[PDB]
Design a protein around this ligand. Structure first.
Ligand SMILES: C[C@H](Oc1ccc(-c2ccccc2)cc1)C(=O)O
Length: 185
């Protein structure tokens, strides 16, 4: 692809983070802690899952960023509306304000309703995310495989400002401790 010149510097918003997440000083990395991280609760924190939002809000234009997922067994990535549900159980779907892909149990899937199987020959170590607000597009790219296309959501009805969206996943197996990292431009 040729989306790299729309690169944006994303940082994580601590106030939205599940209370078990550890965000680095530079707000560019996040991982699952082994316990509650000693923060007060608030109406913005994701309660049920190890999720966090980017600080940046997008309402126009073209945006691109990259995320490192090296040696993770489970994660979700994409964008979401600023007004997505934070508390309780919910599915990741465009109806609920999410445009995401994930890894789970050795398969990759797009967060449509119902979910869509992805066809990835080269397991990615870094994912590129492109948003075209005006066109209603969210696309995902396999940076490990020379930028090959993973998935495009088109005809998106964003219906609000968008925020970068992350889920580091649970670590029940002991094999999913590794962080999500925002990669440098
Ligand atoms: C307690 C903490 O545990 C970590 C465990 C794993 C990783 C990691 C980093 C890059 C790629 C894959 C895994 C980082 C931290 C530490 O040792 O600081």
């Amino acid at each position: 692809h040729h989306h790299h010149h729309h690169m944006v510097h994303i940082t994580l918003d601590r106030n939205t983070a599940n209370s078990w997440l550890i965000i680095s000083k530079d707000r560019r990395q996040v991982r699952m802690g082994d316990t509650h991280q000693n923060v007060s609760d608030n109406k913005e924190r994701f309660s049920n899952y190890p999720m966090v939002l980017g600080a940046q809000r997008f309402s126009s234009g073209k945006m691109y960023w990259e995320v490192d997922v090296t040696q993770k067994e489970a994660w979700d990535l994409g964008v979401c509306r600023d007004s997505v549900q934070r508390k309780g159980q919910f599915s990741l779907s465009p109806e609920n304000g999410f445009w995401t892909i994930w890894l789970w149990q050795d398969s990759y899937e797009a967060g449509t309703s119902p979910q869509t199987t992805l066809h990835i020959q080269v397991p990615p170590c870094q994912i590129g995310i492109f948003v075209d607000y005006e066109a209603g597009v969210v696309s995902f790219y396999n940076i490990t495989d020379h930028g090959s296309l993973i998935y495009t959501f088109s005809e998106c009805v964003f219906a609000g400002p968008l925020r970068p969206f992350f889920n580091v996943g649970f670590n029940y197996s002991g094999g999913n401790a590794a962080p999500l990292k925002l990669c440098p431009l």
